Amino acid sequence: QPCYLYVIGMVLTTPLPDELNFRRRKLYPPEDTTRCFGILTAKPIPQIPHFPVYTRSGEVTISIELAASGFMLSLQMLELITRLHQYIFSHILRLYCVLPLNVVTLDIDFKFMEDIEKSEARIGIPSTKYTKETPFVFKLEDYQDAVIIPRYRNFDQPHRFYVADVYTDLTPLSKFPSPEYETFAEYYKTKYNLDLTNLNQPLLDVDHTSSRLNLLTPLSSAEKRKAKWESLQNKQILVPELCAIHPIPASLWRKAVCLPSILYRLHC
RNA sequence: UGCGAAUUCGCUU
RNA sequence: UGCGAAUUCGCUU
Questions:
Q1: From the record, what ranges are coiled-coil?
Q2: Phi, psi of A8 (to 5 degrees)
């Protein structure tokens, strides 16, 4: 049997208005980045009507458009698409084929997949050898569209964070929030015993990547505790030298988290 | 919107 | 060894 390839078209048709931007976020139109997701099927898809997913940035209209049909794919290629599929749900979201598309005309982003398979920060936390002679080097560009994880805690279940702001006015030698430490560098030294080989780097603003499965629609003592918690998490200021960059870029992570909504919608 | 701890209560016959 | 409610605390920077 041949193949059918659909694009999951996303547009932010209604951006979050100021009065609903409680966590005062930056809005992120999906349509601003060319890479996105798609569905590879054996049987064709019945043209579903446009439907909204409610995301951090506003109301995104989802549309399922046909990209190709009646073509073939090699076993090796299917094995790759497949592995990726399992990776998206087991590792990215921690939950026939969902795969990434990208221009060169949208198409299967095999290279991107090859990079995910090749990256050392794809499953957990990679090791590094920063020394005085081989210092951590900060390239701003690597933190524009990025998702990072702390290298120094949660080995078994790494938390992942959107880079929300690069604070260039800050350094690990800037004053630390809590009184018990003079500086960021001291905090990580006294507490985690981490030495920094770069004391000029900017610091990072973060935003948790976690989401509610179901976004098809727009509080107890449980949200009352998860309040202060999730709030403190997003008030955390991170040091790049201490964070690994995730192979999946942020702007696609934003799109990936709409996937469980969309597939639920399509199966009904 | 998590990992845990304690305390006090509701639902069964 | 569940479904919920309230109260008070621990872990992040």
A1: none
A2: -85, 90
The structural domain count of chain A equals 2
A118 and A251 together in one domain: yes
The technique is X-ray
The experimental resolution of this structure, in angstroms, equals 2.6
SS (H, E, C) A94-144: CCCEEEEEECCCCEECHHHHHHHHHCCCCCCCCCCCCCCCCCCCCCHHHHC
Contacts of A257 (CB under 8 A, 6+ apart): A55, A93, A209, A211, A215
A95 CA vs C13 C1’ separation (Å): 28
User: Shortest CA distance to A248 belongs to which of A154, A161, A137?
Assistant: A161
Q: At what angle do helices A75-87 and A110-118 cross, to 10 degrees?
A: 60
Is residue A133 domain-shared with residue A70, that is, in the same domain?
A: no
Cβ proximity of A148 and A186 under 8 Å: no
Same domain, A3 and A90: yes
Q: Are residues A145 and A239 located together in one domain of the fold?
A: yes
Is residue A174 classed as helix, strand or coil in its secondary structure?
A: coil
Helix (H, G, I), strand (E, B) or coil at A41: strand
Residue A224 CA and nucleotide C4 C1' are separated, in Å, by 16
Helix ranges restricted to H, A119-267: 184-192, 221-233, 250-256, 259-267
Q: Both A96 and A131 in a single domain?
A: no
- Verify that A89 and A214 share a domain, yes or no: yes
Residues 148-167 (A) near nucleic chain C, CB < 7 A: 150, 153
Q: How far is Cα A206 from Cα A242, in angstroms, rounded to an integer? A: 14
A255 and A234 together in one domain: no
Domain co-membership, A110 together with A128: no
* Domain interval for residue A257: 1-123+209-218+246-268
